[PDB]
Amino acid sequence: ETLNGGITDMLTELANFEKNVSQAIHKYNAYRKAASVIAKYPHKIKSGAEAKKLPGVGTKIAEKIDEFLATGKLRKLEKIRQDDTSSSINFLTRVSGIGPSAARKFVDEGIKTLEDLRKNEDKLNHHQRIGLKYFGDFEKRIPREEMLQMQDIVLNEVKKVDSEYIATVCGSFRRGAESSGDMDVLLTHPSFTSESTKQPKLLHQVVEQLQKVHFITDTLSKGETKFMGVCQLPSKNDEKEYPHRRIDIRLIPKDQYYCGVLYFTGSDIFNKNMRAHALEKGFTINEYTIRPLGVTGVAGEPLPVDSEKDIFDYIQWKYREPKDRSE
DNA sequence: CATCTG
DNA sequence: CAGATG
Ligand SMILES: Nc1ccn([C@H]2CC[C@@H](COP(=O)(O)OP(=O)(O)OP(=O)(O)O)O2)c(=O)n1
Ligand SMILES: [Mn+2]
Numbered sequence A: 001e002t003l004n005g006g007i008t009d010m011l012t013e014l015a016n017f018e019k020n021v022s023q024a025i026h027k028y029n030a031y032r033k034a035a036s037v038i039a040k041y042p043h044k045i046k047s048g049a050e051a052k053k054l055p056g057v058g059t060k061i062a063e064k065i066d067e068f069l070a071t072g073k074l075r076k077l078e079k080i081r082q083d084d085t086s087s088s089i090n091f092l093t094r095v096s097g098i099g100p101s102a103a104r105k106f107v108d109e110g111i112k113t114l115e116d117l118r119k120n121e122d123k124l125n126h127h128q129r130i131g132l133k134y135f136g137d138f139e140k141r142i143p144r145e146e147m148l149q150m151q152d153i154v155l156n157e158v159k160k161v162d163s164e165y166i167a168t169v170c171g172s173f174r175r176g177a178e179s180s181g182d183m184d185v186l187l188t189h190p191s192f193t194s195e196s197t198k199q200p201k202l203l204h205q206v207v208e209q210l211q212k213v214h215f216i217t218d219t220l221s222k223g224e225t226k227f228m229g230v231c232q233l234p235s236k237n238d239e240k241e242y243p244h245r246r247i248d249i250r251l252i253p254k255d256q257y258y259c260g261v262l263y264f265t266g267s268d269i270f271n272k273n274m275r276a277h278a279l280e281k282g283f284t285i286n287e288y289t290i291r292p293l294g295v296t297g298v299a300g301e302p303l304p305v306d307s308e309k310d311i312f313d314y315i316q317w318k319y320r321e322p323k324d325r326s327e
Numbered sequence B: 001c002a003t004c005t006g
Numbered sequence C: 001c002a003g004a005t006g
């Protein structure tokens, strides 16, 4: 956790680059198990050979660990930090819409910067365009005090459209968090479930409402159940308009709201121990359901949940206020 | 995983 | 349809 921090980190840079610049997934994958093992490892790796000793740790990695331990640095790491090509790919990639794949193409065409991007707005698609338009705003975190106004909004219009809607703002917002990065809304309706055959309108009508009153400004992606957009809190009395914010909205069968709802609330960490404990308590849990684990090895059967309450209970746990879901 | 591009 | 993105 700090004993092998450097090593784990360099390995991480190294891993990252494989995947992003080069396309060495295998190699890339290599750095990752390595870092994961050297991460859990209890002592102070004093050398390469010491590390080699681990699974995941081969000769190459070992070599690296050595040079790194030997001197506060790594050549290859040094060479990568310079190389403008590598840097460019790391940067283009910040644009929502551009991944490595694409980060690669554009570079090979000469688009390496933001400007390049603007000039070549033609080669970009819709999402990327948006991303480009809001690069800045995209990176600003969401101050909790804003979230409240936002939540305040979605929740009223959702209501107006249908009294039966049930929206929940999950995420870190939901977890206490002073600021968050995106707004995720969970959505269900009594009239939408496991079996029931669809009702896309369910998701569409709200989306519309939101843009009706101008809270949603753009559409990144709109499906029958998942919507990815951009939104903004109405600028008050002209002087300080708000940044454009990322927002996702998801339709869920009413029969698996809470699992989902619970689940998005995270944190990853809160998740697992819950999952793990659930496993003890004789269960199973995922994004949509909880299930009584048979003994034959495994087994299913969607336990019936009417709250986050019904869940914990299952696993015979203490109901965790959202804040306390930290880990 | 669900959505988009091409 | 494979392949990309979040
Ligand atoms: N690959 C992933 C990503 C997320 N999650 C969970 C973690 C919380 C939830 C949605 O949260 P995000 O917006 O991804 O993150 P957050 O925890 O809300 O953090 P923030 O919004 O501050 O970035 O999904 C998961 O199980 N697996
Ligand atoms: Mn989030």
Ligand SMILES: [Mn+2]
Residues within 6 Å of the ligand: A182, A183, A184, A248
């Ligand atoms: Mn999200």
Ligand code: NA
Residues within 6 Å of the ligand: A092, A093, A094, A095, A096, A097, A098, A099
């Ligand atoms: Na990106």
Ligand code: NA
Residues within 6 Å of the ligand: none
């Ligand atoms: Na293939």
